Amino acid sequence: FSGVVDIIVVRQPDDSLKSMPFHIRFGTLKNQNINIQITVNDKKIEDVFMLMLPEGACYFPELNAKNEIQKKLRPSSAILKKFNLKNGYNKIQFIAESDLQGKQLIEGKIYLYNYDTKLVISDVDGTVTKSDWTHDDIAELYTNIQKNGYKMVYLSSRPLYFYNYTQGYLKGIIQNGFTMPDGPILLSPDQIISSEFKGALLKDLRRVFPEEVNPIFAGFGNRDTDATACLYAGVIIDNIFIINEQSQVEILGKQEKSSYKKINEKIQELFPRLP
Numbered sequence: 001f002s003g004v005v006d007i008i009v010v011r012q013p014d015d016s017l018k019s020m021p022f023h024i025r026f027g028t029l030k031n032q033n034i035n036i037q038i039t040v041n042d043k044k045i046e047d048v049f050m051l052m053l054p055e056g057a058c059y060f061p062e063l064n065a066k067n068e069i070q071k072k073l074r075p076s077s078a079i080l081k082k083f084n085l086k087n088g089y090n091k092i093q094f095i096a097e098s099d100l101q102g103k104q105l106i107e108g109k110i111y112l113y114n115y116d117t118k119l120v121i122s123d124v125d126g127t128v129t130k131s132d133w134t135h136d137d138i139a140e141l142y143t144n145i146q147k148n149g150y151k152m153v154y155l156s157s158r159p160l161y162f163y164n165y166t167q168g169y170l171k172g173i174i175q176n177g178f179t180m181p182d183g184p185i186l187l188s189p190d191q192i193i194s195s196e197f198k199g200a201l202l203k204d205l206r207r208v209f210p211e212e213v214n215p216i217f218a219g220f221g222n223r224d225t226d227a228t229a230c231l232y233a234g235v236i237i238d239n240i241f242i243i244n245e246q247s248q249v250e251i252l253g254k255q256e257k258s259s260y261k262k263i264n265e266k267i268q269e270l271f272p273r274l275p
């Protein structure tokens with residue numbers, strides 16, 4: 001695999017920035033001599049460079065306090081702030097220059113959120129697809145949720161080799177006139193490498209935000225363990241939706257039977273509008 005896993009960046013109340021781990025790989029790239037540059041929104045970023053591991057995994061070099069270079073997947077606040085990201089979607093490109101192959105470039109997406117930004121979590125397998133075919137009216141409901149100021153965030157525990165297909169599947173979905181709203185796709189840490197896993201992933205997402213806010217407003221899932229992952233991630237039981245293979249979603253807080261078409265009819269009362 002060669003590509004960029006969607007990156008989430010959150011601006012803190014002290015205007016510092018925190019981010020989730022950078023998962024970028026140059027699989028088809030044929031180690032220590034490789035230097036990696038970054039361009040955000042078609043502009044080159046100076047001072048910021050990444051190194052590559054033998055397998056193709058890339059990291060940010062950062063001295064620690066014992067002056068031992070650390071392999072950090074989360075860039076510093078100063079590095080993230082040289083990106084000069086805009087709020088929402090940003091285009092990021094990683095450029096590896098090799099004497100044997102010239103410069104090789106992978107493109108990805110990096111998202112910037114505020115500490116007060118409200119996220120709506122959705123699973124892909126079983127929640128968008130009908131088994132882990134697409135459930136009906138999910139694109140219209142998700143389009144209206146983004147119109148009300150919420151950010152859709154997708155989760156997938158699929159192998160990293162199928163990450164780019166999952167992006168293609170979600171964005172090729174068309175139900176009536178409504179496309180699927182653009183948002184980051186987070187990958188479970190088991191499918192990646194280190195230099196039930198859904199619950200650990202959501203707390204990395206949560207703890208990127210400050211502790212005193214609950215960033216995840218709602219969550220969509222297919223199994224009862226998805227509900228456990230959202231409850232421990234700060235989501236209230238009223239805002240947890242669980243669907244089966246027969247396209248009936250159950251609101252957990254009130255033990256209420258409903259559907260995507262029914263939740264989209266209650267969009268302003270279940271997802272109040274945010275200016």
Ligand SMILES: [Ca+2]
Nearest residue numbers: 123222223226
């Ligand atoms: Ca699930």
